[PDB]
Structure formats: C-alpha cells, structure tokens
Symmetry: D2
Subunit: 81 residues, 4 copies
C-alpha cells in the first residue's frame, strides 16, 4: 500500500526546465554574439535584440516555473518522507 514512483512526474518536469533554462541561456548568449558582429547593419540588428530580450523573459518565466516545482517537491516530502 505504497504509492509507486509517486514524486516522478514532477521530478522529470523539473529536469525539463533546468535544461530549457540552460538552453535558452546559450541561445541568448549567441544572439548577443550575433548582434555584436553586426555593425550599423540593416533592420536585422534591431530585430535580433528584440529576440534576445524575448529569450531573457522566457528564461525568467521558466526559472519561476522551476522554483515552484522545486519548492513544491520539498513540500510534499515534508514530514513523513
């Protein structure tokens, strides 16, 4: 009479986030890289920096998705664990 894997579907959603976070971080750094190699370019330099910014927010929103799943998994395995 024990829940089987139990804290499993929330374990792997946490993993999915860590690796989505570090991914778009790498993507972010590579957009800024690209932006820098462009100098007084055309209407691509400003489109990229928007895309860069969009990535920063996507990273913030995923970090708080993570913190919840993270902080929540410390909750349900509170007392009696």
């Amino acid at each position: 009479n024990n829940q089987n894997i139990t804290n499993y579907s929330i374990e792997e959603n946490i993993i999915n986030l860590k690796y989505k976070i570090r991914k778009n971080a790498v993507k972010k750094i590579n957009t800024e890289r690209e932006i820098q190699q462009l100098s007084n370019n055309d209407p691509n330099k400003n489109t990229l920096l928007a895309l860069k910014q969009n990535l920063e927010n996507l990273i913030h929103n995923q970090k708080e998705q993570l913190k919840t799943y993270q902080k929540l998994l410390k909750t349900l395995n509170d007392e009696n664990n």
Copy 2:
C-alpha cells in the same frame, strides 16, 4: 552565374521556428484552460490551489512572450524577406 539564393536556408529556419511558436502558443492556451479547471475542482484552502494559480500566471506570461517571439520572427523574415543586408 551569380546564383542569387543564399537566403534559401534562412527562409527555412525562420518558417519552421514560426511553426513552432504557433503550436506552442495554442498548446499553452490548452494548458491554461486545463489549469483553470483543476483550480476549480479544488478547495479554497488546499495549498496546491495556490501552486496551480501561480503555474497559471506563469502560463499567462509564457503565452504572451511567445506571441512576442512570434511577431519578431515574423518581422525578421516577414516583410524583410526584401533583401536587406
């Protein structure tokens, strides 16, 4: 001679990224719907209510930043499929 393509591969890489955001947006609208419903099948007390509430708010930002991501990727290729630099 000239072979005026080169951009061949980047119309491609932008279209597929556009497709991706369009289906992510619609996918997350469902997740938001689902979330609002389990909220409603929950107590006014239960802590997991507050968790769900937040994951819904985070889902409201996500959809919004993916609308913005979409518009962008559009713009980049969108009109400026017009030989810029």
Copy 3:
C-alpha cells in the same frame, strides 16, 4: 476501503499526466506541419540541388519523430485509462 470515488475531486493524477498528453498532441500536430513544409520545399526544389538532399534529409526524421510521438501518446494515455477513468 470502499468510500465513494472522490478521486475526481482533488488529485494530481488527473494532472501532470493530462498535461503531458496535451504536450504530445500538439507536438504531433506541429511536426506534421513541419513535415508538410519539408514536403513542399522538396516539391519546389531542384532534383539535383544541394538543398534537396538536406531537406530530403530532414522530412525523413520528422516522419519517425511523428511516429515515436504517436506511440508516446498511446502509452501516457494507456497510463490514463489505467488509473482514474478506469475504462469507465
């Protein structure tokens, strides 16, 4: 033991899983469109071009992705009928 079936009240079994299947449904539909694109640029392409090979090297794997995603959906779905929604 045998009190009424309030499993439908407050549980993250209906949840967590539910979300994963919604994820798969829409990845399946996304990749179908993506493959349709690849079918299309393979139609408008050359038959001797360098891109026909890469494009004709991307559809392929989207076909297998679509198949492996359809199977993932049956599984997670089977894991749905099995627990709550006990086949009715």
Copy 4:
C-alpha cells in the same frame, strides 16, 4: 553578404538540439535506474519501460537532425565561401 543571419539560424537549431538530446538523455538514465525500482515487479514498471525506450528513439532521432544541420553549417567554411 547577409550570411551572418543564416549561420545564426542554423546555430540556433543546433543549440536547441544539443540540449534536447542532453535532456532526453538525462530522462533515459533516470528511467534506467528507476526501472530497476525495487524488484517488486509492479504495474507502472511496464509503463516506465515503454517511456524509457521511446526516449532512445527520440535521442537517436535528434542526433540525426543535428548532424545534418551541423553538416549543413559545415557547408560554409571551405567548399562554399
């Protein structure tokens, strides 16, 4: 000209794939360990089996999309340009 934006877009598909493969790898390993749960051949061990093995198919599939993209980006240093 204008090939900076193109090396960018391929690179962004490439970075997205490295991390999808890496993420899908972590999920297999963690599904390799947990699938030897605790002998007690329970029901949901059947489900973890299928899940894990569709991870292998995902990984091998991403690994192919990414070599191509990598091979494609490679079409730039030397040969072309």
